Design a protein around this ligand. Sequence first.
Ligand code: HEC
Ligand code: NA
Length: 78
Amino acid sequence: TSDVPPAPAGFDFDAAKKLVDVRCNKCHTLDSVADLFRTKYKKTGQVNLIVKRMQGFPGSGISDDDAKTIGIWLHEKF
Ligand code: HEC
Ligand code: NA
Protein backbone atom coordinates (compact mmCIF):
# COMPACT_ATOMS: atom_id res chain seq x y z
CA THR A 1 0.00 0.00 0.00
CA SER A 2 1.03 3.65 -0.29
CA ASP A 3 3.05 5.30 2.48
CA VAL A 4 1.44 8.60 1.33
CA PRO A 5 -2.29 8.87 2.14
CA PRO A 6 -4.85 10.55 -0.11
CA ALA A 7 -4.57 14.35 -0.45
CA PRO A 8 -6.88 16.55 1.63
CA ALA A 9 -10.07 17.37 -0.24
CA GLY A 10 -9.36 20.53 -2.20
CA PHE A 11 -5.55 20.13 -2.11
CA ASP A 12 -3.79 22.71 -4.28
CA PHE A 13 -1.85 20.50 -6.67
CA ASP A 14 -0.56 23.49 -8.67
CA ALA A 15 1.11 25.00 -5.61
CA ALA A 16 2.42 21.55 -4.65
CA LYS A 17 4.07 21.13 -8.06
CA LYS A 18 5.84 24.46 -7.59
CA LEU A 19 7.21 23.27 -4.24
CA VAL A 20 8.41 19.98 -5.80
CA ASP A 21 10.13 22.03 -8.51
CA VAL A 22 11.89 24.18 -5.92
CA ARG A 23 12.92 21.43 -3.49
CA CYS A 24 13.73 18.53 -5.81
CA ASN A 25 15.97 20.31 -8.35
CA LYS A 26 18.60 21.78 -6.03
CA CYS A 27 21.16 18.95 -5.78
CA HIS A 28 20.21 17.08 -8.93
CA THR A 29 17.43 17.52 -11.44
CA LEU A 30 14.28 15.58 -10.71
CA ASP A 31 14.47 14.54 -14.39
CA SER A 32 17.77 12.73 -13.76
CA VAL A 33 16.13 10.38 -11.25
CA ALA A 34 12.56 10.34 -12.64
CA ASP A 35 12.52 6.87 -14.16
CA LEU A 36 14.13 5.38 -11.08
CA PHE A 37 11.72 7.31 -8.88
CA ARG A 38 8.70 5.87 -10.70
CA THR A 39 9.89 2.25 -10.76
CA LYS A 40 11.64 1.99 -7.39
CA TYR A 41 9.53 4.25 -5.18
CA LYS A 42 6.21 5.27 -6.72
CA LYS A 43 5.28 1.81 -8.05
CA THR A 44 6.19 0.23 -4.69
CA GLY A 45 4.26 2.75 -2.55
CA GLN A 46 7.43 4.13 -0.98
CA VAL A 47 7.24 7.81 -2.01
CA ASN A 48 7.43 9.06 1.59
CA LEU A 49 10.45 6.83 2.20
CA ILE A 50 12.51 8.54 -0.47
CA VAL A 51 11.24 12.10 0.25
CA LYS A 52 12.17 11.70 3.92
CA ARG A 53 15.62 10.35 2.95
CA MET A 54 16.22 13.45 0.83
CA GLN A 55 14.95 15.66 3.64
CA GLY A 56 17.52 14.19 6.01
CA PHE A 57 20.46 15.07 3.74
CA PRO A 58 22.45 18.17 4.78
CA GLY A 59 21.28 21.35 3.05
CA SER A 60 18.03 19.82 1.75
CA GLY A 61 16.01 22.81 3.05
CA ILE A 62 12.96 20.47 3.20
CA SER A 63 10.66 21.03 6.16
CA ASP A 64 8.27 18.39 7.51
CA ASP A 65 5.41 20.28 5.85
CA ASP A 66 7.30 20.46 2.56
CA ALA A 67 7.81 16.69 2.74
CA LYS A 68 4.07 16.12 3.19
CA THR A 69 3.16 18.35 0.23
CA ILE A 70 5.86 16.93 -2.01
CA GLY A 71 4.94 13.32 -1.22
CA ILE A 72 1.29 13.94 -2.04
CA TRP A 73 2.09 15.55 -5.39
CA LEU A 74 4.66 12.92 -6.40
CA HIS A 75 2.32 10.10 -5.34
CA GLU A 76 -0.77 11.45 -7.15
CA LYS A 77 0.59 13.34 -10.17
CA PHE A 78 4.19 12.50 -11.12
C1 HEC B 1 20.45 18.10 -0.39
C2 HEC B 1 20.61 17.57 -1.84
C3 HEC B 1 19.35 16.85 -2.38
C4 HEC B 1 18.07 17.28 -2.46
C5 HEC B 1 17.50 18.66 -2.12
C6 HEC B 1 17.30 16.23 -3.07
N1 HEC B 1 18.13 15.16 -3.33
FE1 HEC B 1 17.59 13.44 -4.27
N2 HEC B 1 19.53 12.76 -4.12
C7 HEC B 1 20.56 13.43 -3.49
C8 HEC B 1 21.75 12.63 -3.51
C9 HEC B 1 23.08 13.04 -2.90
C10 HEC B 1 21.37 11.39 -4.22
C11 HEC B 1 22.30 10.20 -4.52
C12 HEC B 1 22.43 9.31 -3.29
C13 HEC B 1 21.14 8.57 -3.09
O1 HEC B 1 20.75 7.76 -3.97
O2 HEC B 1 20.48 8.83 -2.05
C14 HEC B 1 19.99 11.53 -4.57
C15 HEC B 1 19.23 10.62 -5.25
C16 HEC B 1 17.88 10.66 -5.48
C17 HEC B 1 17.10 9.60 -6.07
C18 HEC B 1 17.68 8.24 -6.52
C19 HEC B 1 17.67 7.28 -5.33
C20 HEC B 1 18.05 5.89 -5.74
O3 HEC B 1 17.47 4.94 -5.19
O4 HEC B 1 18.93 5.72 -6.61
C21 HEC B 1 15.83 10.02 -6.11
C22 HEC B 1 14.58 9.30 -6.65
C23 HEC B 1 15.78 11.36 -5.58
N3 HEC B 1 17.06 11.73 -5.17
C24 HEC B 1 14.65 12.13 -5.47
C25 HEC B 1 14.60 13.38 -4.90
C26 HEC B 1 13.39 14.12 -4.64
C27 HEC B 1 11.99 13.57 -4.99
C28 HEC B 1 13.75 15.27 -4.03
C29 HEC B 1 12.92 16.41 -3.45
C30 HEC B 1 12.16 15.87 -2.21
C31 HEC B 1 15.18 15.29 -3.90
N4 HEC B 1 15.68 14.12 -4.44
C32 HEC B 1 15.95 16.28 -3.34
C33 HEC B 1 20.47 14.69 -2.94
C34 HEC B 1 19.38 15.50 -2.88
NA1 NA C 1 22.93 20.09 -13.61
